[PDB]
Every structure is written in C-alpha cells, then in structure tokens.
Amino acid sequence: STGSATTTPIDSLDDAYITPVQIGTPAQTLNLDFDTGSSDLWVFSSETTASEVDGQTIYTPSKSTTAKLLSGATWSISYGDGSSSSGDVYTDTVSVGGLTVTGQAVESAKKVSSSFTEDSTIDGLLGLAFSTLNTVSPTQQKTFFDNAKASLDSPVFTADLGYHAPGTYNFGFIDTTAYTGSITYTAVSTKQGFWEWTSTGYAVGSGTFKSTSIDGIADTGTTLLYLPATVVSAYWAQVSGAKSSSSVGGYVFPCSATLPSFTFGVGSARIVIPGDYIDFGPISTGSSSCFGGIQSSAGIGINIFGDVALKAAFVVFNGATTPTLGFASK
Secondary structure: OOOEEEEEEOOOOOOEEEEEEEOOOEEEEEEEEEEEOOOOOEOOEEEOOOOHHOOOOEEOHHHHHOEEEEEEEEEEEEOOOOOEEEEEEEEEEEEEEEEEEEEEEEEEEEEHHHHHHHHOOOEEEEEEEHHHHHHEEEEOOHHHHHHHHHHHHOOOEEOOOOOOEEEEEEOOOOOOOOOOOOEEEEEEEEEOOOOOOOOOEEEEEOOOOEEEEEEEOOOOOOOOOEEEEHHHHHHHHOOOEEEEEEOOOOEEEEOOOOOOOOOEHHHHHHEEEEEHEEEEOOOOOOOOOOEEOEEEEEOOOEEEEEOOOOOOOOEEOOOOOOOEEEOOOO
C-alpha cells in the first residue's frame, strides 16, 4: 500500500505545516502537524477542557463506531518549545492520503498548553519519530508509520515541504519526479529516538565549504534551523546589522537586508537553503527588525534540522531494519 497527502503552511511564514488526517468511522478529518521529532498522535477532542479549545476541529470518539477506549492508558508530553498536552487514549481507524491503519492509538487531549489553544489551525500532532519516544503509559504505543510499515510497498515516508507553498508527505514510495539529481543517503542513530544524523559541514553564501561534523535531528515539527553557536555566528556575521538579541530571544537582522544562502552537507552532496527561507519577518507588527531562521542550538542540547532546512530538500525517512535518511535537491 501507499499514501500521499498534501501538507500546507499554517501562515505566511511557514511556522508549521498541517496535513489532513481521517480519524474514525464515519471519518472525522482533523488537520495535524506531522512531527518527525516526536512519537505521539494526539488530537483536540470532545474531552479537551472547554476553555482550552479556541477554533480547533475536535475528535469526538463517541461518534466513531470504530473507536475503543484503551483502558487505563494515559499520555503526557512536553515539547522543546515548552508547550505540552496530556490525556487518555482510544484506538481507532486512521487514514492519511489513502493509507489506512486500523487500531491506531489516538491520544485524546484533556489538557493542552496555551500555545496550542492559541493556534486555531493545528488540531493535533502526528508523530513520526521512533516509537520508543511514545509517551503512552503503561503500555507504549506505536506511531502511524510503525503500524503501517509492514503493509507499505517500501518501508519509507518522504517529506517534501514547500517554501510559502503546499508540499507533500508520501508513505510507502519515493516519487522520482519530485526531486532533481540523486538522493544521497546518510546513516541514522536511533539511540535517542530521533532521526539523528551527521551533516558533513556548511557554507555561508558563496563562501567556501567548511568540513565539520554536525550531529542533529531531522525534525519537521520544528520551524527553524538550530545549529552550533560557532556556525550561527559565522552566518549572521555576513548580514550587516544582524545581532543576537537576548530580549527577543535570538538573532535578528534589519528587514532591509538581503540574506545570504546557507549550504549544509549530506555526505559529499550539498543542500542549499536560499536566503529568503531564512527570513521570519518582523519581530512584532510594523517593526523593521526581522527574526532570523537560523538560530543557536546552545542550551537545547541538540542541533535541529527543522523546516528551514528540510523545505530546501526532498527528504526520505527510510524505516528499513537499519534506518537511514536521504536528501535530494529539488
């Protein structure tokens, strides 16, 4: 089997992407944030504290003939940005782009943090990291991909995120029309539960390539590119007037600037992030100070190849017995 679904930016900055997901019988379609950095499929629901729901579409398990309470199971998650959610668990039928999993754990939120409430466009998350990170207790549950894997034509999914435009998540096949040149594959460590890999270096603009190992995670659920302070300083030093602002929470730059590109290495191959991808716009409405899309990972504890990086590539998440990651230009 295969599936193919379009993923759409939630706003003009590509702060996140939403993908429609069918849950239950009859189908209830919710727009979920596909997140290769976590492993829970959780939704706003009829159980979510009313004051914490503000415009989201909810899953109502009592209206699904295939929903079953997973008795005794609870979940609770906290994300790198400080947001969180928790609740109980149902199993139900879940379909993405024509690919159907029966008995998928659907984690129903009883509580969500303010960041989730305030984002009307995201109805929940669909985790695509390794199932070892799933938070359900006392019986850990599998991700949608892990459940689908054995049925797929090939045990893979791909992320093809757009810049200020829709893109695609495919399951079970590689669309050879969706990228240019060849796909370069690179080793993955699953030791921390992430799609963790080592980039071979970077360049800033038309500058020379610096060969250096950068361990990090491919994370569709993180907006920005978070790299070591040395790398980030080298990038922003090429932008007149750019500075790290403790008050704002990262590097800012004059909105009048033209940003250089940023290149990262995948083995001997190179992925080029155009400068415009690194512009996240005014820090506040009407400001001439703009927020940068490349930020320091210092104090995160891990480097994160988030959407800024991934949307410059066609990315293969290869879930074979020994997982790997593939990157192609597009």
